């Protein structure tokens, strides 16, 4: 039901420079595996959840231009997909929960855009961005703590990480403005 308010036109307006790898239809298809996403709480809670998910993705993926880390210098579990899913344990855990061979074929996240979207929704639900943003009271700042707390929260003003945190708040509050919903007071971390 969230596609009532994040329509194809809204999505395209939010992501005008997206790589064509990423499609609205893939996000819709990925979201059907998590029916609680975008359907939890009041209509305004649902709007905030979509704005928070996609606002965080806008920062993590550079406006849906990021598919995979360009010059990785670690192992095979370098960042892929719109939340830059990284590290062996995340690929193993996500692969098990999604029923995907991400441990042995992590390239799937960069090859298949529905898989890519599913890894972003998996993180959002399993690591509980979903619970933070749909709680009464809601916490956008709690979604930032969960995604990338260790680099962006609790950082001084003017620092690199604090700037990234502020970008998340900017995108979230812009997306809430499109939807006509109050973003809530608990924005920054």
PDB file of C-alpha atoms in Angstrom:
ATOM      1  CA  UNK A   1       0.000   0.000   0.000  1.00  0.00           C
ATOM      2  CA  UNK A   2       2.968   2.363   0.352  1.00  0.00           C
ATOM      3  CA  UNK A   3       3.128   2.592  -3.436  1.00  0.00           C
ATOM      4  CA  UNK A   4       0.034   4.817  -3.113  1.00  0.00           C
ATOM      5  CA  UNK A   5       2.322   7.652  -1.983  1.00  0.00           C
ATOM      6  CA  UNK A   6       5.804   6.654  -3.240  1.00  0.00           C
ATOM      7  CA  UNK A   7       4.635   6.415  -6.863  1.00  0.00           C
ATOM      8  CA  UNK A   8       6.914   5.905  -9.846  1.00  0.00           C
ATOM      9  CA  UNK A   9       6.825   9.693 -10.371  1.00  0.00           C
ATOM     10  CA  UNK A  10       7.824  10.422  -6.763  1.00  0.00           C
ATOM     11  CA  UNK A  11      10.657   7.870  -6.954  1.00  0.00           C
ATOM     12  CA  UNK A  12      11.983   9.297 -10.245  1.00  0.00           C
ATOM     13  CA  UNK A  13      11.841  12.837  -8.858  1.00  0.00           C
ATOM     14  CA  UNK A  14      13.826  11.754  -5.798  1.00  0.00           C
ATOM     15  CA  UNK A  15      16.370   9.783  -7.877  1.00  0.00           C
ATOM     16  CA  UNK A  16      16.803  11.625 -11.185  1.00  0.00           C
ATOM     17  CA  UNK A  17      20.433  10.561 -11.633  1.00  0.00           C
ATOM     18  CA  UNK A  18      19.985   6.882 -10.741  1.00  0.00           C
ATOM     19  CA  UNK A  19      21.893   4.233 -12.596  1.00  0.00           C
ATOM     20  CA  UNK A  20      19.250   2.388 -14.697  1.00  0.00           C
ATOM     21  CA  UNK A  21      20.281  -0.795 -12.860  1.00  0.00           C
ATOM     22  CA  UNK A  22      18.009   0.448 -10.059  1.00  0.00           C
ATOM     23  CA  UNK A  23      14.298   0.401 -10.886  1.00  0.00           C
ATOM     24  CA  UNK A  24      11.149   1.222  -8.986  1.00  0.00           C
ATOM     25  CA  UNK A  25       9.775  -2.188  -9.936  1.00  0.00           C
ATOM     26  CA  UNK A  26      12.725  -3.911  -8.296  1.00  0.00           C
ATOM     27  CA  UNK A  27      12.199  -2.009  -5.054  1.00  0.00           C
ATOM     28  CA  UNK A  28       8.507  -2.936  -5.130  1.00  0.00           C
ATOM     29  CA  UNK A  29       9.352  -6.590  -5.802  1.00  0.00           C
ATOM     30  CA  UNK A  30      11.961  -6.670  -3.040  1.00  0.00           C
ATOM     31  CA  UNK A  31       9.536  -5.088  -0.589  1.00  0.00           C
ATOM     32  CA  UNK A  32       6.936  -7.842  -1.071  1.00  0.00           C
ATOM     33  CA  UNK A  33       9.221 -10.160   0.928  1.00  0.00           C
ATOM     34  CA  UNK A  34       8.829  -7.833   3.912  1.00  0.00           C
ATOM     35  CA  UNK A  35       5.142  -6.911   3.948  1.00  0.00           C
ATOM     36  CA  UNK A  36       5.539  -4.949   7.219  1.00  0.00           C
ATOM     37  CA  UNK A  37       7.837  -2.475   5.465  1.00  0.00           C
ATOM     38  CA  UNK A  38       5.850   0.670   4.741  1.00  0.00           C
ATOM     39  CA  UNK A  39       2.687  -0.803   6.254  1.00  0.00           C
ATOM     40  CA  UNK A  40       3.433  -0.358   9.973  1.00  0.00           C
ATOM     41  CA  UNK A  41       1.785   2.332  12.028  1.00  0.00           C
ATOM     42  CA  UNK A  42      -0.337   5.267  10.905  1.00  0.00           C
ATOM     43  CA  UNK A  43      -0.358   6.566   7.330  1.00  0.00           C
ATOM     44  CA  UNK A  44       2.123   9.192   8.456  1.00  0.00           C
ATOM     45  CA  UNK A  45       4.368   6.526  10.073  1.00  0.00           C
ATOM     46  CA  UNK A  46       4.391   4.674   6.756  1.00  0.00           C
ATOM     47  CA  UNK A  47       5.337   7.824   4.871  1.00  0.00           C
ATOM     48  CA  UNK A  48       8.177   8.531   7.323  1.00  0.00           C
ATOM     49  CA  UNK A  49       9.414   4.980   6.897  1.00  0.00           C
ATOM     50  CA  UNK A  50       9.639   5.265   3.120  1.00  0.00           C
ATOM     51  CA  UNK A  51      11.274   8.692   3.340  1.00  0.00           C
ATOM     52  CA  UNK A  52      13.754   7.383   5.924  1.00  0.00           C
ATOM     53  CA  UNK A  53      14.633   4.267   3.952  1.00  0.00           C
ATOM     54  CA  UNK A  54      15.042   6.102   0.696  1.00  0.00           C
ATOM     55  CA  UNK A  55      16.713   9.137   2.291  1.00  0.00           C
ATOM     56  CA  UNK A  56      19.322   6.862   3.874  1.00  0.00           C
ATOM     57  CA  UNK A  57      19.744   5.065   0.548  1.00  0.00           C
ATOM     58  CA  UNK A  58      20.239   8.408  -1.197  1.00  0.00           C
ATOM     59  CA  UNK A  59      23.267   9.056   1.024  1.00  0.00           C
ATOM     60  CA  UNK A  60      24.622   5.471   0.998  1.00  0.00           C
ATOM     61  CA  UNK A  61      24.297   5.020  -2.781  1.00  0.00           C
ATOM     62  CA  UNK A  62      24.986   8.523  -4.066  1.00  0.00           C
ATOM     63  CA  UNK A  63      21.520   8.873  -5.508  1.00  0.00           C
ATOM     64  CA  UNK A  64      21.347   5.219  -6.681  1.00  0.00           C
ATOM     65  CA  UNK A  65      24.559   5.525  -8.668  1.00  0.00           C
ATOM     66  CA  UNK A  66      26.552   3.105  -6.487  1.00  0.00           C
ATOM     67  CA  UNK A  67      26.444  -0.565  -7.449  1.00  0.00           C
ATOM     68  CA  UNK A  68      29.818  -1.815  -6.174  1.00  0.00           C
ATOM     69  CA  UNK A  69      33.091  -0.618  -4.643  1.00  0.00           C
ATOM     70  CA  UNK A  70      35.412   0.427  -7.489  1.00  0.00           C
ATOM     71  CA  UNK A  71      38.902  -0.449  -6.189  1.00  0.00           C
ATOM     72  CA  UNK A  72      38.266  -2.795  -3.260  1.00  0.00           C
ATOM     73  CA  UNK A  73      41.292  -3.615  -1.136  1.00  0.00           C
ATOM     74  CA  UNK A  74      39.956  -6.145   1.358  1.00  0.00           C
ATOM     75  CA  UNK A  75      38.305  -9.463   0.486  1.00  0.00           C
ATOM     76  CA  UNK A  76      35.404 -10.529  -1.730  1.00  0.00           C
ATOM     77  CA  UNK A  77      32.821  -8.966   0.584  1.00  0.00           C
ATOM     78  CA  UNK A  78      33.376  -5.363  -0.455  1.00  0.00           C
ATOM     79  CA  UNK A  79      30.491  -2.904  -0.639  1.00  0.00           C
ATOM     80  CA  UNK A  80      27.706  -3.744  -3.064  1.00  0.00           C
ATOM     81  CA  UNK A  81      24.175  -2.554  -3.694  1.00  0.00           C
ATOM     82  CA  UNK A  82      22.378   0.579  -2.473  1.00  0.00           C
ATOM     83  CA  UNK A  83      23.434   0.345   1.204  1.00  0.00           C
ATOM     84  CA  UNK A  84      27.010  -0.756   0.359  1.00  0.00           C
ATOM     85  CA  UNK A  85      26.554  -4.138   2.035  1.00  0.00           C
ATOM     86  CA  UNK A  86      29.978  -5.196   3.264  1.00  0.00           C
ATOM     87  CA  UNK A  87      31.806  -7.868   5.268  1.00  0.00           C
ATOM     88  CA  UNK A  88      31.719 -11.638   5.416  1.00  0.00           C
ATOM     89  CA  UNK A  89      29.321 -11.948   8.337  1.00  0.00           C
ATOM     90  CA  UNK A  90      26.762  -9.616   6.747  1.00  0.00           C
ATOM     91  CA  UNK A  91      26.843 -11.587   3.465  1.00  0.00           C
ATOM     92  CA  UNK A  92      26.518 -14.871   5.352  1.00  0.00           C
ATOM     93  CA  UNK A  93      23.664 -13.643   7.535  1.00  0.00           C
ATOM     94  CA  UNK A  94      21.830 -11.832   4.722  1.00  0.00           C
ATOM     95  CA  UNK A  95      22.310 -14.769   2.409  1.00  0.00           C
ATOM     96  CA  UNK A  96      20.800 -17.177   4.916  1.00  0.00           C
ATOM     97  CA  UNK A  97      17.822 -14.922   5.684  1.00  0.00           C
ATOM     98  CA  UNK A  98      17.174 -14.097   2.003  1.00  0.00           C
ATOM     99  CA  UNK A  99      17.756 -17.665   0.776  1.00  0.00           C
ATOM    100  CA  UNK A 100      20.610 -16.497  -1.468  1.00  0.00           C
ATOM    101  CA  UNK A 101      24.152 -17.822  -1.959  1.00  0.00           C
ATOM    102  CA  UNK A 102      25.743 -14.507  -1.008  1.00  0.00           C
ATOM    103  CA  UNK A 103      28.493 -16.224   1.003  1.00  0.00           C
ATOM    104  CA  UNK A 104      29.814 -18.072  -2.011  1.00  0.00           C
ATOM    105  CA  UNK A 105      28.620 -15.688  -4.748  1.00  0.00           C
ATOM    106  CA  UNK A 106      28.681 -12.170  -3.272  1.00  0.00           C
ATOM    107  CA  UNK A 107      28.819 -10.748  -6.842  1.00  0.00           C
ATOM    108  CA  UNK A 108      25.073 -11.517  -7.032  1.00  0.00           C
ATOM    109  CA  UNK A 109      24.407  -8.285  -5.123  1.00  0.00           C
ATOM    110  CA  UNK A 110      25.999  -6.289  -7.959  1.00  0.00           C
ATOM    111  CA  UNK A 111      24.571  -8.447 -10.790  1.00  0.00           C
ATOM    112  CA  UNK A 112      20.872  -8.581  -9.877  1.00  0.00           C
ATOM    113  CA  UNK A 113      19.086  -5.382  -8.891  1.00  0.00           C
ATOM    114  CA  UNK A 114      16.277  -7.185  -7.084  1.00  0.00           C
ATOM    115  CA  UNK A 115      18.893  -8.927  -4.953  1.00  0.00           C
ATOM    116  CA  UNK A 116      20.530  -5.534  -4.436  1.00  0.00           C
ATOM    117  CA  UNK A 117      17.300  -4.008  -3.194  1.00  0.00           C
ATOM    118  CA  UNK A 118      16.620  -7.070  -1.030  1.00  0.00           C
ATOM    119  CA  UNK A 119      19.956  -6.650   0.791  1.00  0.00           C
ATOM    120  CA  UNK A 120      19.001  -3.062   1.646  1.00  0.00           C
ATOM    121  CA  UNK A 121      15.571  -4.061   2.927  1.00  0.00           C
ATOM    122  CA  UNK A 122      17.089  -7.039   4.789  1.00  0.00           C
ATOM    123  CA  UNK A 123      19.382  -4.681   6.684  1.00  0.00           C
ATOM    124  CA  UNK A 124      16.577  -2.183   7.319  1.00  0.00           C
ATOM    125  CA  UNK A 125      14.307  -4.876   8.818  1.00  0.00           C
ATOM    126  CA  UNK A 126      16.759  -7.268  10.431  1.00  0.00           C
ATOM    127  CA  UNK A 127      18.944  -4.597  12.070  1.00  0.00           C
ATOM    128  CA  UNK A 128      15.756  -2.739  12.985  1.00  0.00           C
ATOM    129  CA  UNK A 129      15.863   0.648  11.253  1.00  0.00           C
ATOM    130  CA  UNK A 130      12.249  -0.384  10.677  1.00  0.00           C
ATOM    131  CA  UNK A 131      11.476  -0.518  14.415  1.00  0.00           C
ATOM    132  CA  UNK A 132      13.233   2.784  15.150  1.00  0.00           C
ATOM    133  CA  UNK A 133      11.414   4.795  12.510  1.00  0.00           C
ATOM    134  CA  UNK A 134       7.969   3.260  13.129  1.00  0.00           C
ATOM    135  CA  UNK A 135       8.156   3.374  16.920  1.00  0.00           C
ATOM    136  CA  UNK A 136       5.901   5.684  18.921  1.00  0.00           C
ATOM    137  CA  UNK A 137       7.718   8.020  19.227  1.00  0.00           C
ATOM    138  CA  UNK A 138       9.638   7.728  15.940  1.00  0.00           C
ATOM    139  CA  UNK A 139      13.399   8.087  15.633  1.00  0.00           C
ATOM    140  CA  UNK A 140      15.081   8.963  12.350  1.00  0.00           C
ATOM    141  CA  UNK A 141      18.275   9.451  14.333  1.00  0.00           C
ATOM    142  CA  UNK A 142      17.957   5.833  15.475  1.00  0.00           C
ATOM    143  CA  UNK A 143      18.055   4.692  11.861  1.00  0.00           C
ATOM    144  CA  UNK A 144      21.357   6.542  11.429  1.00  0.00           C
ATOM    145  CA  UNK A 145      22.746   4.901  14.577  1.00  0.00           C
ATOM    146  CA  UNK A 146      21.911   1.480  13.146  1.00  0.00           C
ATOM    147  CA  UNK A 147      23.236   2.052   9.608  1.00  0.00           C
ATOM    148  CA  UNK A 148      26.575   3.707  10.184  1.00  0.00           C
ATOM    149  CA  UNK A 149      26.638   4.906  13.762  1.00  0.00           C
ATOM    150  CA  UNK A 150      30.354   4.207  14.188  1.00  0.00           C
ATOM    151  CA  UNK A 151      31.377   6.726  11.529  1.00  0.00           C
ATOM    152  CA  UNK A 152      28.574   9.331  11.417  1.00  0.00           C
ATOM    153  CA  UNK A 153      26.927   9.612  14.838  1.00  0.00           C
ATOM    154  CA  UNK A 154      28.516  11.317  17.830  1.00  0.00           C
ATOM    155  CA  UNK A 155      30.855  13.303  15.608  1.00  0.00           C
ATOM    156  CA  UNK A 156      31.736  16.993  15.975  1.00  0.00           C
ATOM    157  CA  UNK A 157      30.052  19.648  13.873  1.00  0.00           C
ATOM    158  CA  UNK A 158      32.011  20.274  10.693  1.00  0.00           C
ATOM    159  CA  UNK A 159      33.561  16.808  10.722  1.00  0.00           C
ATOM    160  CA  UNK A 160      33.278  14.453   7.781  1.00  0.00           C
ATOM    161  CA  UNK A 161      31.007  11.996   9.547  1.00  0.00           C
ATOM    162  CA  UNK A 162      28.800  14.709  11.005  1.00  0.00           C
ATOM    163  CA  UNK A 163      28.391  16.111   7.470  1.00  0.00           C
ATOM    164  CA  UNK A 164      27.229  12.705   6.240  1.00  0.00           C
ATOM    165  CA  UNK A 165      24.770  12.459   9.114  1.00  0.00           C
ATOM    166  CA  UNK A 166      23.420  15.882   8.199  1.00  0.00           C
ATOM    167  CA  UNK A 167      23.052  14.761   4.572  1.00  0.00           C
ATOM    168  CA  UNK A 168      20.851  11.886   5.718  1.00  0.00           C
ATOM    169  CA  UNK A 169      18.691  14.349   7.676  1.00  0.00           C
ATOM    170  CA  UNK A 170      18.529  16.670   4.652  1.00  0.00           C
ATOM    171  CA  UNK A 171      17.373  13.917   2.301  1.00  0.00           C
ATOM    172  CA  UNK A 172      14.924  12.494   4.822  1.00  0.00           C
ATOM    173  CA  UNK A 173      13.397  15.890   5.524  1.00  0.00           C
ATOM    174  CA  UNK A 174      13.206  16.704   1.797  1.00  0.00           C
ATOM    175  CA  UNK A 175      11.492  13.382   1.085  1.00  0.00           C
ATOM    176  CA  UNK A 176       9.083  13.947   3.977  1.00  0.00           C
ATOM    177  CA  UNK A 177       8.299  17.351   2.454  1.00  0.00           C
ATOM    178  CA  UNK A 178       7.367  15.705  -0.844  1.00  0.00           C
ATOM    179  CA  UNK A 179       4.987  13.406   1.011  1.00  0.00           C
ATOM    180  CA  UNK A 180       3.515  16.192   3.153  1.00  0.00           C
ATOM    181  CA  UNK A 181       4.460  14.488   6.467  1.00  0.00           C
ATOM    182  CA  UNK A 182       6.202  15.794   9.579  1.00  0.00           C
ATOM    183  CA  UNK A 183       9.673  14.161   9.773  1.00  0.00           C
ATOM    184  CA  UNK A 184       9.517  14.172  13.604  1.00  0.00           C
ATOM    185  CA  UNK A 185      11.812  15.877  16.083  1.00  0.00           C
ATOM    186  CA  UNK A 186      14.392  13.112  16.686  1.00  0.00           C
ATOM    187  CA  UNK A 187      16.546  13.646  13.611  1.00  0.00           C
ATOM    188  CA  UNK A 188      20.230  13.974  14.487  1.00  0.00           C
ATOM    189  CA  UNK A 189      22.744  11.669  16.163  1.00  0.00           C
TER     190      UNK A 189
END
